[PDB]
Design an enzyme around this catalytic site. Structure first.
Site, short mmCIF file in Angstrom:
data_model
loop_
_atom_site.label_atom_id
_atom_site.label_comp_id
_atom_site.label_asym_id
_atom_site.label_seq_id
_atom_site.Cartn_x
_atom_site.Cartn_y
_atom_site.Cartn_z
N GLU A 113 -13.29 13.15 -2.73
CA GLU A 113 -14.01 11.90 -2.53
C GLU A 113 -13.54 11.34 -1.23
O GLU A 113 -12.33 11.11 -1.07
CB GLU A 113 -13.71 10.89 -3.62
CG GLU A 113 -14.46 9.56 -3.48
CD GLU A 113 -14.28 8.57 -4.64
OE1 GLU A 113 -13.71 8.88 -5.72
OE2 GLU A 113 -14.75 7.45 -4.46
N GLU A 199 -16.71 -3.07 -4.19
CA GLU A 199 -16.10 -3.09 -5.50
C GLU A 199 -15.20 -4.32 -5.45
O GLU A 199 -14.26 -4.35 -4.66
CB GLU A 199 -15.25 -1.82 -5.77
CG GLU A 199 -16.04 -0.51 -5.78
CD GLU A 199 -15.31 0.69 -6.41
OE1 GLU A 199 -14.10 0.90 -6.11
OE2 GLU A 199 -15.97 1.42 -7.21
#
Lengths: 218, 404
Positions: A113, A199
């Site tokens: 990622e 986030e």
């Protein structure tokens, strides 16, 4: 016109805009997202939210995600990107990051990622083994800090800006090319996901105003 | 025929016990039950408010009385006795007690699953369980009527459903910290799906052998093994560095002392004084090494710390991870801060591992908080434990099952 559901979504041009409140169960509060403008490979939107509780736990990942076919790194010539945004609100602890994923098949679950954090507000930080930088590279006209850590069966690589970047422009492929050359990521791996989002953990009367955002794969 | 089953679980706030819900009795009533992963059976309070038309006493010298594990037979009430009454010993482990109990059958009904959402209701007409007195509910979450045993017996939920419905003798269980929403346990087969789109399957989980303690801690049967779940920790690593411990304590002996077991009765992970000292010291040591400082020890915790340089991450707070290294060096139960740390308030973070004295039957006991947001699969047939890791890493939580 916005949406406030945990899984509410919206399609606009090249993108799907996700409210994706995956950790709402960890805290108390609200979040509403909406499209402001879109055309093709460019979008505008906003998410207003207030979350309290779970100072450790992420409440959501409101992101705009590009619709594309999984593509090998060694086929990518460039991933041009522009991102301009602003954040209002008090006690904001949240990030604003590009978020991507690399698999060995164009389908299998992810192996790497790779994130590029345009902002780390009020305590927000990347996954880390040591807590220390593994490199401090200068890429696409920005001085970044690179961190690295395990996540299940996935190495997470996060590039964080030295200071909060409300305006950014460049070739996102560079970040891949650098990892391939300096951290031994295979040029044969498939790029499966390309997401730009935020986030938050906790905050009050927040609003992420993404005034323009645009990304492509060449 | 259902492939699997799903019950809700939720954390009671007073006690920190995990509470589940099944349907029992004709007419059906909803029963809240404390989850005891190690427990030997479903046992429910059978006082005068237990009204059912489908209740049946299990007689002694019957097929269903052997299955129960009933070592004796017959009952003496008071003022005379009863010949053969299939007595057993339901246990409240929160209060270390056992009262006597009578095996019985009644209807149990739960939801089926395809592993992604709530299916049609299915039923075990004669589900075998134990009666008990109101007193065995001491110190249990408010509203509950008994205890859901998930231990390794014929008549405990997972093998008894497995048997009833003819599916694989296994259950995954996904505990949450929320008192808010529903968590879930899923009896039957994989793959388990958690919203938005996170699939968890046997290809995805990490597997360690499930070990059998040949003598019982469950200390109420002679030469009868523990029906609990122990796994084989070889060492503890705190951010790549082995902590200096007595590795002999890690291994289960001839007498059944030591080793690592998983439990849902202990809210925080119990560490024996020898391991506790070493783990705590090293955890502090490494936490200071990234400028995370120690603050007063809040109850019930040993170590606690400032949230000044505690960065928030997706995996929790930015503290060293504790890795329990299992049978190989590449198989590890990783514990990030969401699974180690416990927020007291905005400014203080404590370590969620408690000291359990010395001369405790088990050296390491993995507790509720350290189980929260991990899919943990128990395969009784092939004697293994599979685990997902922190589900927060995939951007889901144990509360993201599509339950209805």
């Amino acid at each position: 016109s916005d949406f406030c559901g945990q899984w509410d979504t919206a399609t606009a041009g090249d993108f799907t805009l996700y409210n994706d409140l995956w950790g709402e169960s960890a805290g108390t509060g609200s979040q509403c997202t909406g499209v402001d403008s879109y055309s093709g490979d460019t979008i505008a939107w906003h998410t207003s939210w207030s979350w309290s509780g779970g100072s450790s736990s992420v409440k959501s990942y409101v992101n705009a995600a590009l619709t594309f076919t999984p593509t090998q790194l060694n086929c990518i010539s460039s991933i041009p990107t522009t991102w301009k945004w602003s954040y209002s609100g008090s006690s904001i602890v949240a990030d604003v990051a590009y978020d991507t994923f690399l698999a060995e098949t164009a389908s299998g679950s992810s192996k790497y990622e790779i994130m590029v954090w345009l902002a780390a507000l009020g305590g927000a930080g990347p996954i880390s083994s040591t807590g220390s930088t593994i490199a401090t590279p200068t890429i696409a006209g920005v001085n970044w800090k690179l961190y690295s850590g395990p996540n299940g069966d996935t190495t997470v690589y996060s590039f964080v800006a030295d200071s909060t970047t409300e305006s950014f422009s460049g070739d996102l492929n560079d970040f891949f090319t650098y990892l391939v050359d300096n951290e031994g990521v295979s040029d044969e791996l498939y790029l499966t996901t390309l997401e730009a989002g935020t986030e938050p953990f906790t905050g009050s009367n927040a609003k992420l105003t993404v005034s323009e955002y645009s990304i492509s794969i060449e | 025929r259902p492939s699997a089953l799903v019950v809700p679980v939720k954390k009671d706030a007073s006690t920190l016990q995990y509470v589940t819900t099944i349907n029992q009795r004709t007419p059906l009533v909803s029963e809240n039950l404390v989850v005891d992963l190690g427990g030997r059976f479903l046992w429910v309070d059978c006082d005068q408010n237990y009204v059912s038309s489908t209740y049946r006493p299990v007689r002694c010298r019957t097929s269903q009385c052997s299955l129960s594990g009933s070592i004796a037979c017959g009952d003496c009430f008071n003022g005379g006795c009863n010949n053969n009454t299939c007595g057993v010993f339901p246990e409240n482990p929160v209060i270390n007690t056992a009262t006597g109990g009578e095996v019985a059958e009644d209807v149990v009904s739960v939801e089926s699953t395809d592993g992604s959402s709530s299916g049609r209701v299915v039923t075990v007409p004669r589900f075998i369980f134990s009666c008990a007195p109101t007193s065995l509910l001491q110190n249990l979450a408010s509203g509950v009527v008994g205890m859901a045993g998930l231990g390794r017996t014929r008549i405990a939920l997972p093998s008894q459903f497995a048997s009833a419905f003819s599916f694989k003798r296994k259950f995954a269980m996904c505990l949450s910290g929320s008192t808010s929403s529903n968590s879930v346990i899923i009896f039957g087969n994989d793959p388990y799906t958690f919203l938005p789109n996170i699939i968890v399957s046997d290809k995805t989980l990490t597997y360690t052998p499930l070990l059998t303690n040949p003598v019982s801690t469950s200390a109420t049967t002679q030469g009868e093994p523990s029906v609990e779940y122990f796994i084989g920790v070889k060492s503890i690593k705190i951010n790549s560095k082995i902590v200096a411990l007595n590795t002999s304590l890690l291994s289960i002996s001839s007498a059944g002392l030591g080793g690592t077991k998983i439990s849902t009765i202990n809210p925080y992970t119990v560490l024996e004084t020898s391991i506790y000292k070493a783990v705590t010291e090293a955890f502090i040591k490494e936490s200071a090494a990234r400028n995370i400082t120690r603050v007063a020890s809040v109850a019930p915790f040993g170590a606690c710390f400032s949230t000044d340089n505690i960065l928030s991450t997706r995996l929790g707070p930015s503290v060293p991870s504790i890795d329990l290294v299992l049978q190989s060096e590449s198989v590890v139960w990783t514990i990030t801060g969401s699974n180690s740390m416990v927020y007291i308030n905005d400014n203080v973070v404590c370590l969620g591992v408690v000291d359990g004295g010395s001369n405790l039957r088990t050296s390491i006991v993995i507790g509720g908080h350290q189980l929260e947001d991990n899919l943990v699969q128990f395969d009784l047939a092939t004697s293994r434990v599979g685990f997902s890791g922190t589900l927060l890493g995939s951007r889901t939580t144990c509360a993201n099952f599509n339950f209805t």
